[PDB]
């Protein structure tokens, strides 16, 4: 079994754990940007961060947000990161687009802010009900997109699965498994 691979610059895994307990530079969060205490990713993170934090995104909020908007970041307060990246669910189109739009946004965000390690809870798997599959096909399809076109720019990656939500890891762990072998990585087991 493994649950790590590494692939030109960048090293992506898989870990059973919560989103809200990582160090990392750069956290994930997943919200509807109307009412940021809504979902268990969404209050795991801000009861973690603290108050301060909802303050913040609000007054990020009011200044930036618009209907292009995907990601708004804000502080990490005292979560263990830098910043925290809030992917914001607000329209009608499939998840699955904007999914795959937002994942892209937060990896393109780690060269602007020069970030070496980012960590990812299975976003849109829950509330948004989004296929196991078709969430780690997409997660996969961006990191190794982000390792081929930002070669020089290392960066770890961890894709953060709930303990108890087993199918997701087993579909994110069939995917790795795929990659690993296509592209001949070298994988390990923590
Ligand atoms: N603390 C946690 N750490 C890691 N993963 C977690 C945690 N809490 C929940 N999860 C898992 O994170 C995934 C995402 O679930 P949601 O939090 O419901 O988020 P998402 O599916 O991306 O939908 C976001 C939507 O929910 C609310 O934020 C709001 O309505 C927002 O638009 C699911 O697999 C869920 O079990």
């Known amino acids: 079994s493994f649950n790590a691979m590494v692939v030109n610059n960048l090293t992506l895994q898989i870990v059973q754990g919560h989103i809200e307990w990582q160090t990392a530079d750069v956290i994930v969060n997943s919200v509807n940007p109307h009412d940021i205490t809504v979902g268990p990713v969404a209050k795991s993170i801000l009861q973690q961060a603290g108050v301060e934090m909802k303050s913040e995104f609000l007054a990020t909020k009011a200044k ?3 209907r292009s908007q ?16 809030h992917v914001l669910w607000h329209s009608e189109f499939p998840k699955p687009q904007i999914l795959k739009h937002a994942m892209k946004e937060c990896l393109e965000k780690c060269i602007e802010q020069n970030i070496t390690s980012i960590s990812f809870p299975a976003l849109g798997t829950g509330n948004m009900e989004i296929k ?6 997409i997660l996969f399809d961006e990191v190794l997109t982000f390792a081929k076109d930002h070669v020089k720019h290392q960066l770890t990656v961890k894709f953060v ?13 069939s995917e790795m498994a795929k990659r690993s072998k296509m ?7 923590v």
């Open 132 to 137: 196991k599959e078709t969430a780690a096909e």
């Open 161 to 173: 699965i709930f303990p108890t939500d087993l199918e997701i890891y087993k579909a994110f762990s």
């Open 183 to 189: 592209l001949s990585l070298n994988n390990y087991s």
């Open 64 to 66: 930036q947000f618009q």
């Open 70 to 85: 995907l990601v708004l970041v804000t502080k990490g307060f005292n979560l263990f990161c830098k910043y925290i990246y």
